[PDB]
Amino acid sequence: GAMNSSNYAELFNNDIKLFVDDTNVYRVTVHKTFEGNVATKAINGCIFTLNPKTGHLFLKIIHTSVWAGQKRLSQLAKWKTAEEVSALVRSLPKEEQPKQIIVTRKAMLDPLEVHMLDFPNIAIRPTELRLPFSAAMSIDKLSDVVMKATEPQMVLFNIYDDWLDRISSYTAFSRLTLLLRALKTNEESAKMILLSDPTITIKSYHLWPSFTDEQWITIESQMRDLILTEYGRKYNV
Amino acid sequence: MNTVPFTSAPIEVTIGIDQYSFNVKENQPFHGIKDIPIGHVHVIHFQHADNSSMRYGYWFDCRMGNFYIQYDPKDGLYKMMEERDGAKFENIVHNFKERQMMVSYPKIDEDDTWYNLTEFVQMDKIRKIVRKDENQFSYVDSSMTTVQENELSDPAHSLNYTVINFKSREAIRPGHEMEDFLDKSYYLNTVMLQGIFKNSSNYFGELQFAFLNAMFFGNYGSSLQWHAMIELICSSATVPKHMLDKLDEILYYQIKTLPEQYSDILLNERVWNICLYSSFQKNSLHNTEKIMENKYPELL
Numbered sequence: 344g345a346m347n348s349s350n351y352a353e354l355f356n357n358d359i360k361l362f363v364d365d366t367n368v369y370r371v372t373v374h375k376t377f378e379g380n381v382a383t384k385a386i387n388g389c390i391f392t393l394n395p396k397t398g399h400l401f402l403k404i405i406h407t408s409v410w411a412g413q414k415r416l417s418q419l420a421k422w423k424t425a426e427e428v429s430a431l432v433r434s435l436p437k438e439e440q441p442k443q444i445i446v447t448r449k450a451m452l453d454p455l456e457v458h459m460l461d462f463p464n465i466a467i468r469p470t471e472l473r474l475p476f477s478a479a480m481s482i483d484k485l486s487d488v489v490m491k492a493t494e495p496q497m498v499l500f501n502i503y504d505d506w507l508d509r510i511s512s513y514t515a516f517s518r519l520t521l522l523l524r525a526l527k528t529n530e531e532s533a534k535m536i537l538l539s540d541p542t543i544t545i546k547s548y549h550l551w552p553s554f555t556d557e558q559w560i561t562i563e564s565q566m567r568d569l570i571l572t573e574y575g576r577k578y579n580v
Numbered sequence: 581m582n583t584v585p586f587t588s589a590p591i592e593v594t595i596g597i598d599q600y601s602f603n604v605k606e607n608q609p610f611h612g613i614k615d616i617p618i619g620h621v622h623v624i625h626f627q628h629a630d631n632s633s634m635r636y637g638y639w640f641d642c643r644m645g646n647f648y649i650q651y652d653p654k655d656g657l658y659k660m661m662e663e664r665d666g667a668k669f670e671n672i673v674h675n676f677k678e679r680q681m682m683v684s685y686p687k688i689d690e691d692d693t694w695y696n697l698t699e700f701v702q703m704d705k706i707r708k709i710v711r712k713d714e715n716q717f718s719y720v721d722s723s724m725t726t727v728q729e730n731e732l733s734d735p736a737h738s739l740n741y742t743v744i745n746f747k748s749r750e751a752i753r754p755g756h757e758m759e760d761f762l763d764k765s766y767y768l769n770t771v772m773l774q775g776i777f778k779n780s781s782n783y784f785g786e787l788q789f790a791f792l793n794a795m796f797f798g799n800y801g802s803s804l805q806w807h808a809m810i811e812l813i814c815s816s817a818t819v820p821k822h823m824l825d826k827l828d829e830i831l832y833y834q835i836k837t838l839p840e841q842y843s844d845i846l847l848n849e850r851v852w853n854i855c856l857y858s859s860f861q862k863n864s865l866h867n868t869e870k871i872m873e874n875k876y877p878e879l880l
């Protein structure tokens with residue numbers, strides 16, 4: 344059923360699974376028109392489909408042309424997400440297809456179930472977890488590729504960089520969620536933390552800086568503080 | 581006007597005949613029901629005084645044979661049977677009528693309730709849903725499960741209603757996933773009406789028979805089927821005008837007839853609120869919406 348605090352280690356077992364987050368698929372800027380009314384302008388979006396055991400991220404870029412001439416875009420966005428996830432699954436060899444897909448928002452359940460009717464043995468699950476994947480567009484290299492896209496495109500990344508050479512997938516996921524939660528709470532502060540020391544760089548083929556083990560401990564501490572303070576900065580404690 | 585004689589009444593029982601019902605005491609000199617209108621199906625149903633568990637009964641049409649009821653002390657229930665000897669049967673009935681040992685089907689002349697609840701219900705279709713081909717009448721009880729309930733366990737004793745499943749390949753055309761799920765017209769008109777039922781009369785007949793089994797026996801799978809067949813229409817943007825008008829009348833009489841005190845278990849809040857207030861047909865069921873709002877405004 345639903346994935347929650349009690350069945351957390353299931354994410355790092357050897358059954359292939361994917362998280363799907365649709366919060367960045369349909370993105371708009373809201374603005375005034377010459378007549379003083381309000382309109383929206385769409386901007387490029389993305390589906391965030393992540394294997395939490397390996398770090399493989401299938402980033403399907405959603406170009407604004409997909410919305411042209413369509414109505415009820417926030418409803419369409421869920422079905423488009425389900426269509427693209429289904430297409431990804433069909434594109435993978437049988438032995439790479441997931442056994443479960445976990446959607447971060449419950450409104451994705453019926454769209455995905457209907458698009459996956461051909462795969463009766465792939466379980467579609469919700470989660471009670473407050474997963475921070477909306478903050479993926481605060482990762483500079485991810486935001487850059489989404490905004491530059493001029494057509495539909497899938498781009499593959501490992502969201503863990505090379506961390507799995509040194510740490511387990513449980514620990515890598517915990518670091519990822521702490522970083523992403525930090526970026527969601529105060530993006531400026533979080534980004535200041537990550538880049539303050541110019542001698543630690545981001546490799547061309549990575550998303551995050553090349554911290555030593557000891558430097559990740561300090562970084563992780565700084566991110567908890569940022570969120571620790573921000574659990575009062577708005578909520579006064 | 582036809583008659584269903586009873587050999588006797590050895591156990592105390594509430595007997596129903598269509599929407600009517602009367603109590604018979606243990607060993608009371610009761611010998612059946614006369615003046616049954618010809619031209620409709622009918623249901624004769626039972627609830628024992630000592631075990632209200634298991635309401636059960638028989639669907640029948642007196643044009644198809646001479647039927648009577650006889651209690652079986654081994655299986656412990658009132659059983660319907662056919663008498664093939666027509667002269668023996670006429671003789672029995674005439675004796676019981678002369679001794680005035682039969683209740684009269686108590687139809688008020690102004691009253692079209694039974695017709696309105698069974699307009700599209702045919703015995704031939706009942707017998708395909710309830711499979712027992714050696715008999716011309718059909719037994720149903722509170723506990724019998726439906727084919728679809730079994731899929732999710734004895735098949736000979738099942739209600740073979742047409743399976744409806746909105747998240748199924750039958751319901752969803754490849755490449756029309758969002759379209760077919762949010763507007764079920766394809767599934768209603770092509771798959772179900774043109775393909776399976778053939779015409780709307782047979783669809784309405786199964787819908788009416790499911791409601792009646794839900795109401796008279798508390799059969800949960802029948803209630804599920806009734807609501808699914810309503811929801812499939814209401815969730816279709818394109819429905820023939822005559823079908824919507826007839827559906828409004830069908831549901832009006834069903835809601836009118838439902839016992840006020842059974843609404844909590846026989847009416848699904850989600851389906852009805854969706855059908856009357858959100859669906860494509862939210863404005864096409866005026867009669868049904870008015871009776872629902874005046875009789876069960878809590879549910880809504």
Ligand SMILES: CCNC(=O)c1ccccc1Br
Nearest residue numbers: 473524528570573574575577
């Ligand atoms: C802004 C303060 N933090 C939060 O609101 C929050 C929300 C969801 C999950 C974790 C946190 Br720490």
